[PDB]
From a paper:
The endoplasmic reticulum (ER) Hsp70 chaperone [name] is regulated by AMPylation, a reversible inactivating post-translational modification. Here we present crystallographic and solution structures of a [name] Michaelis complex formed between mammalian [name] [name] and [name]. The latter, via its tetratricopeptide repeat domain, binds a surface that is specific to ATP-state Hsp70 chaperones, explaining the exquisite selectivity of [name] for [name]’s ATP-bound conformation both when AMPylating and deAMPylating Thr518.
A complex of otherwise wild-type dimeric FICDH363A and [name] [name] readily crystallised, but despite extensive efforts, these crystals did not yield useful diffraction data. However, the introduction of a monomerising Leu258Asp mutation and truncation of [name]’s flexible α-helical lid facilitated purification of a heterodimeric FICDL258D-H363A·BiPT229A-V461F-AMP complex (see the “Methods” section) that crystallised and produced two very similar sub-2 Å datasets. The crystal structures displayed (identical) extensive bipartite protein–protein interfaces totalling 1366 Å2 (state 1 crystal structure is shown). The second interface, by which [name]’s catalytic Fic domain engaged [name]’s SBDβ (671 Å2), contained an intermolecular β-sheet between [name]’s Thr518-bearing loop (ℓ7,8) and the Fic domain flap. Contacts between the AMP moiety and the [name] active site contributed an additional 306 Å2 interaction surface to the [name] complex. The state 1 [name] complex crystal structure contains well-resolved electron density for [name]’s [name] Thr518 residue within [name]’s active site. The phosphate of Thr518-AMP is coordinated by a Mg2+ held in position by Asp367 of [name]’s Fic motif.
Numbering used by the authors:
A (entry chain B): 28 to 549
B (entry chain A): 103 to 442
Write the structure that this text describes.
């Protein structure tokens, strides 16, 4: 059928379709071209997704779920997860060392969801939005991820797609999608573009060389836990503290109070992008008492200035990685809802010595637009011509070797897909196994890098220590996802080396159950 | 793959513009999307030929034609590069032949050659066991063979591999190198019996009865080993083989034997010994495939598996030149001049 492009955002999602040589961004049942990444369960047992879910947040906060994009592919322990918990009204519980969501689904029946299942529901709503417009069922999608998403976050997004009953034909990096939206109609030849992508919860900077349908990522750098959500948290925390200073009342107890403040903080932040102060008014805020405060643009900026200034570091990083001057940048492309913030536009403009950003780029829709184009290409039946993406892996991949050493195999900014092989050996006589610990990061010791996964390699034949020649191969596919394989390079019996997948990610049996659970609401 | 096609089309457009770095990236992307993409292999060959890399151009045209034997553009291209590659490969053999004659031109009053040849012998045992993962140092190997004393805190297996190699080389140099007549299966078994004799005296000097793997290579079923070894030794003693350049003869002898992999173990050690028997019978010094070349060695063997043995022949040729260069450098005499 029709392959759709879905921007699966932290706060909002957007679906587009490529038909008759152009992109249509599809309005949902409420006429909105962007859909809140929200799900909710009513006391009656009705599953709400999108606007309906977000609009009952303040009356049912404990059983309203959002921010799933900042939970997928992370540990329970993650300081970033613990930060968000303080501002999330729903129970986040540790299950297999990962943050699961526990909600009352109705009739005093509690269900515990993987963050992948929440994102699956959001993807289901975006699919339903497309199906309503197309008047035919949608089975295939291109889904976007932040460029700086690690292996686990990418796989979790694919898994969310699978659970939503979608064939995810391709995971596309959000800034690369944005570059396609900018570059498709342009026939200007070779250009260097800086895509600055500050969305609801993730920040990416990608430097691309675009050239008459070729989209070449030169360098990428970002932060998968920096965006609109963090700016809202800073303002919420400010006003929760101000309330305790004024009244003595700690409002962190009342979830309805905290989430009422969240809703009004979002409205205020949006207002402050076109005016210099916003009134925050809440009736029956805490213990039947009213809230009334002014937020100035200056105060909003002060509360977030460290975070705003921090967005310049990845811009500096991609220029350094690419060995390009500021003057080599032909276009600055601002995408993600948070690039509407005047101070963000000002910091980028001043970094590039007064250079204005590209005109006619809707920062809320550009990522979905690009996803829709790539969906059209992979559909194979949309006459899209010779569009070629040459994307890169965002993180250096390595294997832990004796002494907790980061043995680097694939450097950051390597074009994907890619393959790297290296021969390793045993640390003791007749060692029958490798515990292959794959790390993401730059540090020479793995303790200072991020564990991608643990892979059990079995069937190493008996031999003295350091004698076996076990080739370990890293393959990064076109989705940016790692496969680990191994081969004895020596003479051996017919029984090849076996690698068992990491046991700490969702198995096919777990995904099958989550798929079957999701199908019931079809 | 429509994706692969798009990448090749863009590769050709960027090449036309003179954006050769981008063209190369796009060719490589096309061949990642479809490794057996015949149009992409052929056009990437043209790209190599434009950069005056005739061997790589010909490699790609030949690879294309193994997939699609009647491919018009690949046939025309291969027909052009075939004689050019023969000229290039033969020129390298001529350079190697000159350097062999340079080694033989060393005066018999040269003091350095005697000691260098002795050192090189122990270097040969080090490299042939080390390339297979043996952890013994050159000094440890010298100690094992000169003294016969066991090195402490090292496996019996690794030491028994070295003792076996010493026994095998002594047998070859004293019985086979100077012997008149055909090289038989029985001769190869006698070499293997010494190679593996101290590690595995049960398997030493007999063909495997089980299926083995050799890295990525799947050798014949054990029941087919005798017949393939008979066909191998027929080729070894053929006038066709005798008419090859000794480097090509020795390289093909090595490859043909490890392809069969007739033994449970020691196929590489035995094949490298046979390679050097052939070179030494042809009047060449024995050559070394260095421990550090392990990864390159496996790559060109895999290239041979995939249907082009020439990268392996060229690899063995370069090992031969390196051996000759090292021998000539090590035996250089530095002249004393009168001020005048
Ligand atoms: P086993 O220890 O008996 O033999 C090892 C030798 O086999 C050769 N070899 C390695 N990899 C290949 C491939 N891919 N194809 C053919 N022969 C191969 C080398 O000579 C090893 O030393
Ligand atoms: Mg072996």
């Amino acid at each position: 059928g029709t392959v759709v492009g879905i921007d699966l955002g932290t706060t909002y999602s957007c679906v587009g379709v490529f038909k008759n040589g152009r992109v249509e961004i599809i309005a949902n049942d409420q006429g909105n071209r962007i859909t809140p990444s929200y799900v909710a369960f009513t006391p009656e047992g009705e599953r709400l997704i999108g606007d309906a879910a977000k609009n009952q947040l303040t009356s049912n906060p404990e059983n309203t779920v959002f921010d799933a994009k900042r939970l997928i592919g992370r540990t329970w322990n993650d300081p970033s997860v613990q930060q968000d918990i303080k501002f999330l009204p729903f129970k986040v519980v540790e299950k297999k060392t990962k943050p699961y969501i526990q909600v009352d689904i109705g009739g005093g029946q509690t269900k515990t969801f993987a963050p992948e299942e929440i994102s699956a529901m959001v993807l289901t709503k975006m699919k339903e939005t497309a199906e309503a417009y197309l008047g035919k069922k949608v089975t295939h999608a291109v889904v976007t991820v932040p460029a700086y998403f690690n292996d686990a976050q990418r796989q979790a997004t694919k898994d969310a797609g699978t659970i939503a009953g979608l064939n995810v034909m391709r995971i596309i990096n959000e800034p690369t999608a944005a570059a396609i939206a900018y570059g498709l109609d342009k026939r200007e030849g070779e250009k260097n573009i800086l895509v600055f992508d500050l969305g609801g919860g993730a920040f990416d900077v990608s430097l691309l060389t675009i050239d008459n349908g070729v989209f070449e990522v030169v360098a990428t750098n970002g932060d998968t836990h920096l965006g609109g959500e963090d700016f809202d948290q800073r303002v919420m925390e400010h006003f929760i503290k101000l309330y305790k200073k004024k009244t003595g009342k700690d409002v962190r107890k009342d979830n309805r109070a905290v989430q009422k403040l969240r809703r009004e903080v979002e409205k205020a932040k949006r207002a402050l992008s076109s005016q210099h102060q916003a009134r925050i008014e809440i009736e029956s805020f805490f213990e039947g008492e009213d809230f009334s405060e002014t937020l100035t643009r200056a105060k909003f900026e002060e509360l977030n200035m460290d975070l705003f200034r921090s967005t310049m570091k990845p811009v500096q990083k991609v220029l350094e990685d690419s060995d390009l001057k500021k003057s080599d940048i032909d276009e600055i492309v601002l995408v993600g809802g948070s690039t509407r913030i005047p101070k963000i536009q000002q910091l980028v403009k001043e970094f590039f010595n007064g250079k204005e950003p590209s005109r006619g780029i809707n920062p809320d829709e550009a990522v979905a637009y690009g996803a829709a184009v790539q969906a059209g290409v992979l559909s194979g039946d949309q006459d899209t011509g010779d569009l070629v993406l040459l994307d890169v892996c965002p993180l250096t991949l390595g294997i832990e070797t004796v002494g907790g050493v980061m043995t680097k195999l694939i450097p950051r900014n390597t074009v994907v897909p890619t393959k790297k092989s290296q021969i390793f050996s045993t640390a003791s006589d007749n060692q029958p196994t490798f515990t292959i610990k794959v790390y993401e990061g730059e540090r020479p010791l793995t303790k200072d890098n991020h564990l991608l996964g643990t892979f059990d390699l079995t069937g190493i034949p008996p031999a003295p220590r350091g004698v076996p020649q076990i080739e370990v191969t890293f393959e990064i596919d076109v989705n940016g996802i790692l496969r680990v394989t191994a081969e004895d390079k020596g003479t051996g019996n017919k029984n090849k080396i076996t690698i068992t997948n990491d046991q700490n990610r969702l198995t096919p049996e777990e995904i099958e159950r989550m798929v079957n659970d999701a199908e019931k609401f079809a | 793959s429509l994706e692969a096609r798009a990448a090749l089309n863009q590769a050709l457009e960027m090449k036309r513009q003179g954006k050769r770095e981008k063209a190369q990236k796009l060719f490589m992307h096309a061949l990642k999307m479809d490794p057996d993409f015949v149009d992409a292999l052929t056009e990437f060959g043209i790209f190599s030929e434009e950069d005056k890399d005739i061997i790589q151009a010909d490699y790609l045209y030949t690879r294309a034609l193994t997939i699609s034997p009647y491919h018009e553009k690949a046939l025309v291209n291969r027909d052009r590069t075939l004689p050019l590659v023969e000229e290039i490969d033969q020129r390298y053999f001529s350079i190697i032949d000159s350097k062999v004659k340079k080694v033989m031109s060393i005066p018999k009053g040269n003091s350095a050659l005697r000691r260098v040849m002795e050192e090189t012998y122990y270097h040969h045992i080090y490299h042939t066991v080390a390339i297979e993962g043996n952890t013994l140092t050159l000094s440890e190997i010298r100690h094992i063979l000169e003294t016969r004393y066991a090195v402490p805190g090292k496996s019996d297996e690794e030491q028994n591999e070295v003792i076996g190699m010493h026994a095998a080389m002594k047998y070859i140099n004293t019985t086979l190198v100077s012997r008149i007549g055909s090289v038989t299966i029985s001769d190869v078994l006698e070499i293997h019996r010494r190679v593996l004799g101290y590690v595995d005296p049960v398997e030493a000097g007999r063909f495997r009865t089980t299926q083995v793997l050799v890295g990525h290579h799947i050798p014949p079923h054990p029941q087919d080993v005798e017949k393939q070894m008979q066909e191998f030794v027929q080729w070894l003693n053929s006038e066709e083989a005798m008419n090859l350049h000794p480097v090509e003869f020795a390289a093909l002898a090595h490859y043909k034997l490890v392809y069969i992999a007739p033994f449970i173990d020691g196929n590489g050690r035995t094949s490298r010994l046979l390679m050097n028997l052939i070179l030494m019978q042809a009047g060449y010094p024995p050559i070394t495939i260095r421990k550090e070349q392990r990864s390159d060695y496996y790559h060109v063997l895999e290239a041979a598996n995939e249907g082009d043995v020439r990268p392996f022949i060229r690899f063995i040729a370069k090992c031969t030149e390196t051996t000759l260069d090292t021998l000539l450098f090590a035996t250089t005499e530095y002249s004393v001049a009168l001020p005048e």
